[PDB]
Amino acid sequence: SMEQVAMELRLTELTRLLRSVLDQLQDKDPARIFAQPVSLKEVPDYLDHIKHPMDFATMRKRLEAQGYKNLHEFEEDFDLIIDNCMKYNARDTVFYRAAVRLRDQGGVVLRQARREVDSIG
């Protein structure tokens, strides 16, 4: 149907905007602490601690399959990155501190993304 095509064009354009959001959030992680999944070879107990692991590469795979239907879904995954790190790692660690700085900096980006998603519809 033509309606299905129009809905698909909306999804594609959301995907465009989320890709730009993702790039901007990932620049706030210059150490690449959140770039890849936590390695279960190197942290064998990880899944005993963290039930829904997340990282920027995993988000990018979902994004490129157009697997985010709305900004809320994308933000859920971003918050998992931060929240998982702040639980597994102690306050005095470079990992925890990195997550705090990512959350703080990403807030700015996400704030305007929400306005854009609503504005462009």
mmCIF file of all heavy atoms in Angstrom, residues 41-79, unseen atoms left out:
data_model
loop_
_atom_site.group_PDB
_atom_site.id
_atom_site.type_symbol
_atom_site.label_atom_id
_atom_site.label_comp_id
_atom_site.label_asym_id
_atom_site.label_seq_id
_atom_site.Cartn_x
_atom_site.Cartn_y
_atom_site.Cartn_z
ATOM 1 N N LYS A 41 34.685 -13.616 27.536
ATOM 2 C CA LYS A 41 35.978 -14.312 27.773
ATOM 3 C C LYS A 41 36.755 -13.605 28.873
ATOM 4 O O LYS A 41 37.227 -14.228 29.821
ATOM 5 C CB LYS A 41 36.804 -14.452 26.455
ATOM 6 C CG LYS A 41 36.153 -15.344 25.419
ATOM 7 N N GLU A 42 36.827 -12.271 28.824
ATOM 8 C CA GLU A 42 37.563 -11.463 29.828
ATOM 9 C C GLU A 42 36.845 -11.101 31.176
ATOM 10 O O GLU A 42 37.513 -10.755 32.201
ATOM 11 C CB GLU A 42 38.034 -10.187 29.166
ATOM 12 C CG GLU A 42 38.887 -10.478 27.914
ATOM 13 C CD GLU A 42 39.193 -9.246 27.067
ATOM 14 O OE1 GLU A 42 38.683 -8.162 27.422
ATOM 15 O OE2 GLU A 42 39.916 -9.394 26.032
ATOM 16 N N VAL A 43 35.507 -11.092 31.122
ATOM 17 C CA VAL A 43 34.635 -10.919 32.290
ATOM 18 C C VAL A 43 33.609 -12.052 32.324
ATOM 19 O O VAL A 43 32.409 -11.872 32.039
ATOM 20 C CB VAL A 43 33.960 -9.529 32.308
ATOM 21 C CG1 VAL A 43 33.274 -9.330 33.669
ATOM 22 C CG2 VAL A 43 34.990 -8.402 32.018
ATOM 23 N N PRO A 44 34.068 -13.285 32.705
ATOM 24 C CA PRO A 44 33.221 -14.469 32.589
ATOM 25 C C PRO A 44 31.957 -14.457 33.458
ATOM 26 O O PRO A 44 30.986 -15.073 33.023
ATOM 27 C CB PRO A 44 34.172 -15.652 32.960
ATOM 28 C CG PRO A 44 35.331 -15.008 33.597
ATOM 29 C CD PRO A 44 35.453 -13.614 33.088
ATOM 30 N N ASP A 45 31.983 -13.741 34.587
ATOM 31 C CA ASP A 45 30.798 -13.608 35.463
ATOM 32 C C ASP A 45 29.819 -12.500 35.023
ATOM 33 O O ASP A 45 28.860 -12.279 35.742
ATOM 34 C CB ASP A 45 31.189 -13.403 36.951
ATOM 35 C CG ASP A 45 31.741 -12.000 37.311
ATOM 36 O OD1 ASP A 45 31.934 -11.107 36.483
ATOM 37 O OD2 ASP A 45 32.061 -11.769 38.524
ATOM 38 N N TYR A 46 30.048 -11.838 33.883
ATOM 39 C CA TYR A 46 29.321 -10.561 33.653
ATOM 40 C C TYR A 46 27.789 -10.714 33.669
ATOM 41 O O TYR A 46 27.069 -9.862 34.230
ATOM 42 C CB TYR A 46 29.761 -9.913 32.334
ATOM 43 C CG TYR A 46 29.255 -8.480 32.106
ATOM 44 C CD1 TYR A 46 29.631 -7.491 32.935
ATOM 45 C CD2 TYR A 46 28.446 -8.187 31.056
ATOM 46 C CE1 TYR A 46 29.231 -6.182 32.723
ATOM 47 C CE2 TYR A 46 27.986 -6.871 30.828
ATOM 48 C CZ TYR A 46 28.378 -5.897 31.671
ATOM 49 O OH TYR A 46 27.984 -4.589 31.519
ATOM 50 N N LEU A 47 27.310 -11.781 33.056
ATOM 51 C CA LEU A 47 25.870 -11.987 32.926
ATOM 52 C C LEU A 47 25.207 -12.420 34.228
ATOM 53 O O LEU A 47 24.001 -12.385 34.302
ATOM 54 C CB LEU A 47 25.516 -12.997 31.818
ATOM 55 C CG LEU A 47 26.010 -12.726 30.412
ATOM 56 C CD1 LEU A 47 25.522 -13.812 29.447
ATOM 57 C CD2 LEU A 47 25.624 -11.344 29.912
ATOM 58 N N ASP A 48 25.990 -12.785 35.253
ATOM 59 C CA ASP A 48 25.466 -12.975 36.575
ATOM 60 C C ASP A 48 25.097 -11.624 37.182
ATOM 61 O O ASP A 48 24.244 -11.512 38.066
ATOM 62 C CB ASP A 48 26.452 -13.649 37.514
ATOM 63 C CG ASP A 48 26.789 -15.113 37.148
ATOM 64 O OD1 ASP A 48 26.068 -15.772 36.397
ATOM 65 O OD2 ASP A 48 27.815 -15.561 37.687
ATOM 66 N N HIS A 49 25.778 -10.565 36.735
ATOM 67 C CA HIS A 49 25.573 -9.219 37.250
ATOM 68 C C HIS A 49 24.588 -8.398 36.382
ATOM 69 O O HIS A 49 23.657 -7.711 36.905
ATOM 70 C CB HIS A 49 26.941 -8.481 37.299
ATOM 71 C CG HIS A 49 27.876 -9.066 38.269
ATOM 72 N ND1 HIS A 49 27.986 -8.591 39.547
ATOM 73 C CD2 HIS A 49 28.717 -10.119 38.177
ATOM 74 C CE1 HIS A 49 28.886 -9.302 40.205
ATOM 75 N NE2 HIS A 49 29.358 -10.234 39.382
ATOM 76 N N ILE A 50 24.817 -8.403 35.105
ATOM 77 C CA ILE A 50 24.126 -7.549 34.160
ATOM 78 C C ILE A 50 23.253 -8.456 33.249
ATOM 79 O O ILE A 50 23.731 -9.295 32.499
ATOM 80 C CB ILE A 50 25.135 -6.751 33.323
ATOM 81 C CG1 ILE A 50 25.910 -5.777 34.257
ATOM 82 C CG2 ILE A 50 24.407 -6.013 32.229
ATOM 83 C CD1 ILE A 50 25.117 -4.821 35.116
ATOM 84 N N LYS A 51 21.946 -8.213 33.344
ATOM 85 C CA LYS A 51 21.007 -9.052 32.603
ATOM 86 C C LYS A 51 20.742 -8.671 31.185
ATOM 87 O O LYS A 51 20.316 -9.548 30.367
ATOM 88 C CB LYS A 51 19.694 -9.152 33.366
ATOM 89 C CG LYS A 51 19.898 -9.782 34.748
ATOM 90 C CD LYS A 51 20.268 -11.242 34.663
ATOM 91 C CE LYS A 51 20.739 -11.827 35.974
ATOM 92 N NZ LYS A 51 21.422 -13.147 35.826
ATOM 93 N N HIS A 52 20.893 -7.378 30.848
ATOM 94 C CA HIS A 52 20.702 -6.901 29.482
ATOM 95 C C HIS A 52 21.960 -6.018 29.120
ATOM 96 O O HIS A 52 21.887 -4.791 29.164
ATOM 97 C CB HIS A 52 19.419 -6.107 29.435
ATOM 98 C CG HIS A 52 18.207 -6.974 29.714
ATOM 99 N ND1 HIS A 52 17.592 -7.028 30.951
ATOM 100 C CD2 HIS A 52 17.602 -7.927 28.950
ATOM 101 C CE1 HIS A 52 16.608 -7.923 30.912
ATOM 102 N NE2 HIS A 52 16.599 -8.484 29.713
ATOM 103 N N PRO A 53 23.043 -6.698 28.711
ATOM 104 C CA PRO A 53 24.243 -5.954 28.249
ATOM 105 C C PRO A 53 23.909 -5.061 27.046
ATOM 106 O O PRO A 53 23.024 -5.412 26.221
ATOM 107 C CB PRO A 53 25.170 -7.045 27.792
ATOM 108 C CG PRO A 53 24.818 -8.232 28.556
ATOM 109 C CD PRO A 53 23.293 -8.164 28.617
ATOM 110 N N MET A 54 24.660 -3.958 26.897
ATOM 111 C CA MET A 54 24.472 -3.106 25.744
ATOM 112 C C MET A 54 25.773 -2.376 25.481
ATOM 113 O O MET A 54 26.596 -2.196 26.395
ATOM 114 C CB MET A 54 23.285 -2.129 25.941
ATOM 115 C CG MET A 54 22.860 -1.438 24.644
ATOM 116 S SD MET A 54 22.623 -2.333 23.127
ATOM 117 C CE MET A 54 21.444 -3.582 23.677
ATOM 118 N N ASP A 55 25.911 -1.925 24.265
ATOM 119 C CA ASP A 55 27.118 -1.180 23.831
ATOM 120 C C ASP A 55 26.797 -0.484 22.480
ATOM 121 O O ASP A 55 25.791 -0.825 21.831
ATOM 122 C CB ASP A 55 28.269 -2.168 23.667
ATOM 123 C CG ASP A 55 27.989 -3.115 22.571
ATOM 124 O OD1 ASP A 55 27.363 -4.154 22.810
ATOM 125 O OD2 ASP A 55 28.339 -2.821 21.347
ATOM 126 N N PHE A 56 27.659 0.440 22.032
ATOM 127 C CA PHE A 56 27.378 1.177 20.831
ATOM 128 C C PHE A 56 27.395 0.319 19.552
ATOM 129 O O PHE A 56 26.630 0.601 18.593
ATOM 130 C CB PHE A 56 28.339 2.330 20.652
ATOM 131 C CG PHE A 56 28.149 3.487 21.590
ATOM 132 C CD1 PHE A 56 29.250 4.036 22.276
ATOM 133 C CD2 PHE A 56 26.929 4.142 21.708
ATOM 134 C CE1 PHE A 56 29.104 5.133 23.045
ATOM 135 C CE2 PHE A 56 26.805 5.277 22.500
ATOM 136 C CZ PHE A 56 27.909 5.741 23.218
ATOM 137 N N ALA A 57 28.205 -0.741 19.466
ATOM 138 C CA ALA A 57 28.188 -1.549 18.257
ATOM 139 C C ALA A 57 26.882 -2.308 18.101
ATOM 140 O O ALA A 57 26.330 -2.436 17.009
ATOM 141 C CB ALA A 57 29.377 -2.505 18.204
ATOM 142 N N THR A 58 26.379 -2.807 19.211
ATOM 143 C CA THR A 58 25.103 -3.538 19.238
ATOM 144 C C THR A 58 23.998 -2.563 18.839
ATOM 145 O O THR A 58 23.110 -2.932 18.066
ATOM 146 C CB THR A 58 24.884 -4.250 20.566
ATOM 147 O OG1 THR A 58 26.004 -5.129 20.825
ATOM 148 C CG2 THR A 58 23.579 -5.019 20.674
ATOM 149 N N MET A 59 24.045 -1.330 19.338
ATOM 150 C CA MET A 59 23.013 -0.351 18.974
ATOM 151 C C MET A 59 23.042 -0.049 17.463
ATOM 152 O O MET A 59 21.996 0.031 16.799
ATOM 153 C CB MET A 59 23.160 0.979 19.736
ATOM 154 C CG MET A 59 22.888 0.925 21.254
ATOM 155 S SD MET A 59 22.818 2.509 22.114
ATOM 156 C CE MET A 59 21.456 3.257 21.277
ATOM 157 N N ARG A 60 24.246 0.079 16.937
ATOM 158 C CA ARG A 60 24.422 0.361 15.530
ATOM 159 C C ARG A 60 23.856 -0.778 14.660
ATOM 160 O O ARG A 60 23.253 -0.512 13.630
ATOM 161 C CB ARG A 60 25.877 0.700 15.254
ATOM 162 C CG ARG A 60 26.071 1.417 13.916
ATOM 163 C CD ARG A 60 27.551 1.888 13.825
ATOM 164 N NE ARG A 60 27.974 2.915 14.810
ATOM 165 C CZ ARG A 60 27.738 4.240 14.703
ATOM 166 N NH1 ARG A 60 27.009 4.702 13.699
ATOM 167 N NH2 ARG A 60 28.184 5.116 15.620
ATOM 168 N N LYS A 61 24.055 -2.023 15.055
ATOM 169 C CA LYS A 61 23.460 -3.165 14.323
ATOM 170 C C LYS A 61 21.916 -3.041 14.299
ATOM 171 O O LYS A 61 21.257 -3.167 13.252
ATOM 172 C CB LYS A 61 23.812 -4.506 14.949
ATOM 173 N N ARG A 62 21.336 -2.775 15.464
ATOM 174 C CA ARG A 62 19.878 -2.609 15.524
ATOM 175 C C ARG A 62 19.434 -1.407 14.683
ATOM 176 O O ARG A 62 18.460 -1.499 13.901
ATOM 177 C CB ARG A 62 19.431 -2.513 16.921
ATOM 178 C CG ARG A 62 17.969 -2.326 17.100
ATOM 179 C CD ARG A 62 17.492 -2.686 18.495
ATOM 180 N NE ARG A 62 16.084 -2.236 18.661
ATOM 181 C CZ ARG A 62 15.438 -2.148 19.801
ATOM 182 N NH1 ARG A 62 16.067 -2.358 20.973
ATOM 183 N NH2 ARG A 62 14.180 -1.710 19.795
ATOM 184 N N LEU A 63 20.158 -0.331 14.776
ATOM 185 C CA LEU A 63 19.821 0.862 14.010
ATOM 186 C C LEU A 63 19.798 0.585 12.508
ATOM 187 O O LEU A 63 18.836 0.921 11.811
ATOM 188 C CB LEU A 63 20.860 1.936 14.264
ATOM 189 C CG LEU A 63 20.653 3.281 13.593
ATOM 190 C CD1 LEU A 63 19.377 3.921 14.067
ATOM 191 C CD2 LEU A 63 21.818 4.204 13.847
ATOM 192 N N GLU A 64 20.874 -0.006 12.011
ATOM 193 C CA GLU A 64 20.976 -0.257 10.567
ATOM 194 C C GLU A 64 19.996 -1.298 10.032
ATOM 195 O O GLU A 64 19.736 -1.323 8.841
ATOM 196 C CB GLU A 64 22.400 -0.593 10.192
ATOM 197 C CG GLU A 64 23.387 0.539 10.386
ATOM 198 C CD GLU A 64 22.982 1.888 9.767
ATOM 199 O OE1 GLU A 64 22.204 1.891 8.778
ATOM 200 O OE2 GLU A 64 23.456 2.936 10.272
ATOM 201 N N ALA A 65 19.400 -2.119 10.886
ATOM 202 C CA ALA A 65 18.297 -2.931 10.530
ATOM 203 C C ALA A 65 16.970 -2.182 10.699
ATOM 204 O O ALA A 65 15.919 -2.843 10.753
ATOM 205 C CB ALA A 65 18.219 -4.166 11.397
ATOM 206 N N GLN A 66 17.018 -0.854 10.867
ATOM 207 C CA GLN A 66 15.805 -0.083 11.255
ATOM 208 C C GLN A 66 14.990 -0.677 12.390
ATOM 209 O O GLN A 66 13.743 -0.704 12.357
ATOM 210 C CB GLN A 66 14.937 0.147 9.994
ATOM 211 C CG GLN A 66 15.684 0.908 8.946
ATOM 212 C CD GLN A 66 14.786 1.301 7.757
ATOM 213 O OE1 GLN A 66 13.697 0.772 7.600
ATOM 214 N NE2 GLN A 66 15.208 2.282 7.010
ATOM 215 N N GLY A 67 15.694 -1.125 13.445
ATOM 216 C CA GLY A 67 15.071 -1.749 14.561
ATOM 217 C C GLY A 67 14.634 -0.837 15.702
ATOM 218 O O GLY A 67 14.094 -1.335 16.682
ATOM 219 N N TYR A 68 14.865 0.482 15.578
ATOM 220 C CA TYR A 68 14.285 1.436 16.549
ATOM 221 C C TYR A 68 13.002 2.110 15.943
ATOM 222 O O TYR A 68 13.131 2.916 15.045
ATOM 223 C CB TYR A 68 15.313 2.483 16.994
ATOM 224 C CG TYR A 68 16.490 1.879 17.776
ATOM 225 C CD1 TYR A 68 17.791 1.894 17.263
ATOM 226 C CD2 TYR A 68 16.326 1.359 19.037
ATOM 227 C CE1 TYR A 68 18.854 1.369 17.980
ATOM 228 C CE2 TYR A 68 17.418 0.762 19.745
ATOM 229 C CZ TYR A 68 18.662 0.784 19.186
ATOM 230 O OH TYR A 68 19.747 0.224 19.881
ATOM 231 N N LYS A 69 11.860 1.801 16.511
ATOM 232 C CA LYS A 69 10.552 2.369 16.016
ATOM 233 C C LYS A 69 10.319 3.808 16.434
ATOM 234 O O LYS A 69 9.547 4.512 15.796
ATOM 235 C CB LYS A 69 9.353 1.519 16.491
ATOM 236 N N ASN A 70 10.987 4.246 17.503
ATOM 237 C CA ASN A 70 10.801 5.572 18.090
ATOM 238 C C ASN A 70 12.073 5.929 18.890
ATOM 239 O O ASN A 70 12.929 5.057 19.104
ATOM 240 C CB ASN A 70 9.546 5.635 18.954
ATOM 241 C CG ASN A 70 9.487 4.559 20.047
ATOM 242 O OD1 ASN A 70 10.428 4.408 20.858
ATOM 243 N ND2 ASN A 70 8.379 3.822 20.108
ATOM 244 N N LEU A 71 12.202 7.194 19.239
ATOM 245 C CA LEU A 71 13.343 7.642 20.081
ATOM 246 C C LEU A 71 13.385 7.002 21.449
ATOM 247 O O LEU A 71 14.540 6.718 21.948
ATOM 248 C CB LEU A 71 13.314 9.138 20.267
ATOM 249 C CG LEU A 71 14.418 9.821 21.031
ATOM 250 C CD1 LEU A 71 15.796 9.573 20.464
ATOM 251 C CD2 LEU A 71 14.166 11.320 21.217
ATOM 252 N N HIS A 72 12.242 6.744 22.073
ATOM 253 C CA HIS A 72 12.183 6.073 23.387
ATOM 254 C C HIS A 72 12.969 4.735 23.381
ATOM 255 O O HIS A 72 13.784 4.479 24.298
ATOM 256 C CB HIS A 72 10.735 5.862 23.896
ATOM 257 C CG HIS A 72 10.645 5.199 25.224
ATOM 258 N ND1 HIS A 72 11.016 5.833 26.391
ATOM 259 C CD2 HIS A 72 10.322 3.932 25.570
ATOM 260 C CE1 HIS A 72 10.907 4.990 27.403
ATOM 261 N NE2 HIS A 72 10.464 3.832 26.933
ATOM 262 N N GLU A 73 12.743 3.913 22.363
ATOM 263 C CA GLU A 73 13.482 2.612 22.238
ATOM 264 C C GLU A 73 15.026 2.794 22.185
ATOM 265 O O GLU A 73 15.730 2.011 22.779
ATOM 266 C CB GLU A 73 13.044 1.860 21.006
ATOM 267 C CG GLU A 73 11.629 1.311 21.162
ATOM 268 C CD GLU A 73 11.175 0.395 20.020
ATOM 269 O OE1 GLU A 73 11.866 0.337 19.009
ATOM 270 O OE2 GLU A 73 10.144 -0.311 20.194
ATOM 271 N N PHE A 74 15.497 3.776 21.418
ATOM 272 C CA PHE A 74 16.879 4.130 21.263
ATOM 273 C C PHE A 74 17.426 4.609 22.594
ATOM 274 O O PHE A 74 18.482 4.153 23.049
ATOM 275 C CB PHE A 74 17.037 5.166 20.176
ATOM 276 C CG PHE A 74 18.433 5.650 19.930
ATOM 277 C CD1 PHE A 74 19.238 5.111 18.967
ATOM 278 C CD2 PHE A 74 18.911 6.712 20.687
ATOM 279 C CE1 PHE A 74 20.484 5.642 18.677
ATOM 280 C CE2 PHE A 74 20.187 7.215 20.480
ATOM 281 C CZ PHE A 74 20.991 6.675 19.485
ATOM 282 N N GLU A 75 16.727 5.522 23.210
ATOM 283 C CA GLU A 75 17.161 5.992 24.566
ATOM 284 C C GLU A 75 17.218 4.890 25.602
ATOM 285 O O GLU A 75 18.138 4.926 26.460
ATOM 286 C CB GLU A 75 16.226 7.083 25.103
ATOM 287 C CG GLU A 75 16.311 8.365 24.355
ATOM 288 C CD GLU A 75 15.239 9.347 24.833
ATOM 289 O OE1 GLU A 75 14.063 8.946 25.102
ATOM 290 O OE2 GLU A 75 15.571 10.501 24.901
ATOM 291 N N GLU A 76 16.305 3.922 25.551
ATOM 292 C CA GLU A 76 16.345 2.770 26.461
ATOM 293 C C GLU A 76 17.710 2.055 26.381
ATOM 294 O O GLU A 76 18.329 1.798 27.447
ATOM 295 C CB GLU A 76 15.206 1.751 26.192
ATOM 296 C CG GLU A 76 13.813 2.219 26.610
ATOM 297 C CD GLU A 76 12.782 1.104 26.731
ATOM 298 O OE1 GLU A 76 12.899 0.048 26.056
ATOM 299 O OE2 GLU A 76 11.853 1.303 27.551
ATOM 300 N N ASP A 77 18.147 1.796 25.144
ATOM 301 C CA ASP A 77 19.438 1.115 24.879
ATOM 302 C C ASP A 77 20.580 2.017 25.355
ATOM 303 O O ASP A 77 21.529 1.511 25.990
ATOM 304 C CB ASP A 77 19.596 0.702 23.414
ATOM 305 C CG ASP A 77 18.998 -0.660 23.135
ATOM 306 O OD1 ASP A 77 18.514 -1.355 24.094
ATOM 307 O OD2 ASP A 77 19.004 -1.080 21.947
ATOM 308 N N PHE A 78 20.540 3.323 25.057
ATOM 309 C CA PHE A 78 21.603 4.194 25.568
ATOM 310 C C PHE A 78 21.695 4.198 27.107
ATOM 311 O O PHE A 78 22.774 4.067 27.712
ATOM 312 C CB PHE A 78 21.411 5.611 25.041
ATOM 313 C CG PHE A 78 22.430 6.598 25.536
ATOM 314 C CD1 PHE A 78 23.743 6.502 25.139
ATOM 315 C CD2 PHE A 78 22.058 7.653 26.313
ATOM 316 C CE1 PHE A 78 24.695 7.379 25.562
ATOM 317 C CE2 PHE A 78 23.023 8.587 26.761
ATOM 318 C CZ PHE A 78 24.325 8.438 26.360
ATOM 319 N N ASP A 79 20.566 4.250 27.744
ATOM 320 C CA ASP A 79 20.532 4.237 29.203
ATOM 321 C C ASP A 79 21.079 2.897 29.740
ATOM 322 O O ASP A 79 21.735 2.942 30.781
ATOM 323 C CB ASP A 79 19.114 4.450 29.710
ATOM 324 C CG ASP A 79 18.672 5.947 29.584
ATOM 325 O OD1 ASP A 79 19.527 6.850 29.530
ATOM 326 O OD2 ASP A 79 17.468 6.179 29.589
#
